[PDB]
Design an enzyme around this catalytic site. Structure first.
Site, PDB file in Angstrom:
ATOM      1  N   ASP A  34       4.102  23.766   1.802  1.00 33.18           N
ATOM      2  CA  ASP A  34       4.635  23.322   3.078  1.00 33.18           C
ATOM      3  C   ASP A  34       3.905  23.987   4.213  1.00 33.18           C
ATOM      4  OD1 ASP A  34       6.401  22.043   4.825  1.00 33.18           O
ATOM      5  OD2 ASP A  34       7.617  23.797   5.008  1.00 33.18           O
ATOM      6  N   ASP A 220       1.853  18.706   8.622  1.00 31.15           N
ATOM      7  CA  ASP A 220       2.962  19.173   7.766  1.00 31.15           C
ATOM      8  C   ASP A 220       2.959  18.501   6.414  1.00 31.15           C
ATOM      9  OD1 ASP A 220       5.267  20.259   6.722  1.00 31.15           O
ATOM     10  OD2 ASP A 220       6.596  19.204   8.115  1.00 31.15           O
TER      11      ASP A 220
END
Ligand SMILES: Fc1ccc(CC2CCNCC2)cc1
Length: 377
Positions: A34, A220
């Site tokens: 992430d 992201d």
């Protein structure tokens, strides 16, 4: 770096994870990759959805920081106890680091039922670390404690199982075609970048570019969607809808409130337009553009129990936190997080899904004036 090729796995919509080991002797855990957060946090209690969890009691090297952490998103959250321990990546560099680890002891709508991951590796910067920027992110510790170069790169493929590569400390040229183009990291908190122009099928949205970045644009890996701010999304959708008038779909579909379906092998590629985001370049008044497809913003939902047809979800959506270049974008490209030089490189991915009608592209240079005005203060 061939050791690290294909070291990521996942299922559609549930993110990409890498194997890591924590503690001594090593406990194996699958950990979500992430780039939109900065805590290393792992399940540490037997929540029923979890295959595995961190058992701090089995570890010689564990050290309690005697502090807690509470990490909410929209209802919501995880909550944990901080510490440090020794950490390796089996299909990563050949090192072992002492890293901060949030041992997750309570959560709500964090873990996913049916998933094969048990934690999250936040790869962004200390500024957004919880509870505060003094908690050193994993990658900082990695770079600080070893000779691994300060960069990592991601090739997210996706097909059901998805796959990919996280190359830690370097670039693998097998993973892309043509040239890498770099956009500056505007600030080291999220991986913040600046979009300077947007074309749908090759047509500008004539929008104060400052909007495109209201109040953020970020890269992201933990987000499935290309996500756009209200006003940009509203205009975004306006043109995608008109680009695609050939056939119609409901209001909800565009708001991600209903999925769309066609029969197997009967979808219209071409009734949908390409998206091109022009990113700020390395040089004053110079930009480049990345071009994706509806295969990227149309993601085929595997098995709805209430249908046997080919059903896809509209992967674009609104935000009040801003633009989010997620899996929709990143799966088109090999993406290089050049932390050392504060820049993010994009190249056409060697694994992106293409044919001989249209293809994903990274092209430059273009001349774009007032690219700073696109940034928000
Ligand atoms: F199921 C989830 C919920 C929340 C998160 C953390 C987010 C951090 C920013 N990038 C998207 C994921 C992961 C998984």
């Amino acid at each position: 770096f061939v050791e690290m090729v294909d070291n990521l796995r996942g299922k559609s919509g549930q993110g990409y994870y890498v194997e890591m080991t924590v503690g001594s002797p090593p406990q194996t855990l699958n950990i979500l990759v992430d780039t939109g957060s900065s805590n290393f946090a792992v399940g540490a209690a037997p929540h029923p959805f979890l295959h595995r969890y961190y058992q701090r009691q089995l570890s010689s090297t564990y050290r309690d920081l005697r502090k807690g952490v509470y990490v909410p998103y929209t209802q919501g959250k995880w909550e944990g106890e901080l510490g440090t321990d020794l950490v390796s990546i089996p299909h990563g560099p050949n090192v072992t680091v002492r890293a901060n680890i949030a041992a997750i002891t309570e959560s709500d709508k964090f873990f996913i039922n049916g998933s094969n991951w048990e934690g999250i590796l936040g790869l962004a910067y200390a500024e957004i670390a919880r509870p505060d920027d003094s908690l050193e992110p994993f990658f900082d510790s990695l770079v600080k404690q070893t000779h691994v170069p300060n960069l990592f790169s991601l090739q997210l493929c996706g097909a059901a199982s998805v796959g990919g590569s996280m190359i830690i400390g370097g670039i693998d040229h097998s993973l892309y075609t043509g040239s890498l183009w770099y956009t500056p990291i505007r600030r080291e908190w999220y991986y913040e970048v600046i979009i300077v122009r947007v074309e749908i099928n090759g047509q500008d949205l004539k929008m104060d570019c400052k909007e495109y970045n209201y109040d953020k644009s970020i890269v992201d890996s933990g987000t499935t969607n290309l996500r756009l701010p209200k006003k940009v999304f509203e205009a975004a959708v306006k043109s995608i809808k008109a680009a695609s008038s050939t056939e119609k779909f409901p209001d909800g579909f565009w708001l991600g409130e209903q999925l769309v379906c066609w029969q197997a092998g009967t979808t219209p590629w071409n009734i949908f337009p390409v998206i091109s985001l022009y990113l700020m370049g390395e040089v004053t008044n110079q930009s480049f553009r990345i071009t994706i497809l509806p295969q990227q913003y149309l993601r085929p939902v595997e098995d709805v129990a209430t249908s046997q047809d080919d059903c896809y979800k509209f992967a674009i959506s609104q935000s009040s936190t801003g633009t989010v270049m997620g899996a929709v974008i990143m799966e088109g490209f090999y993406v290089v997080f050049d932390r050392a030089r504060k820049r993010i490189g994009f190249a056409v991915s060697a694994c992106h899904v293409h044919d001989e009608f249209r293809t994903a592209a990274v092209e430059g240079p273009f001349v774009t004036l007032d690219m700073e005005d696109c940034g928000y203060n």
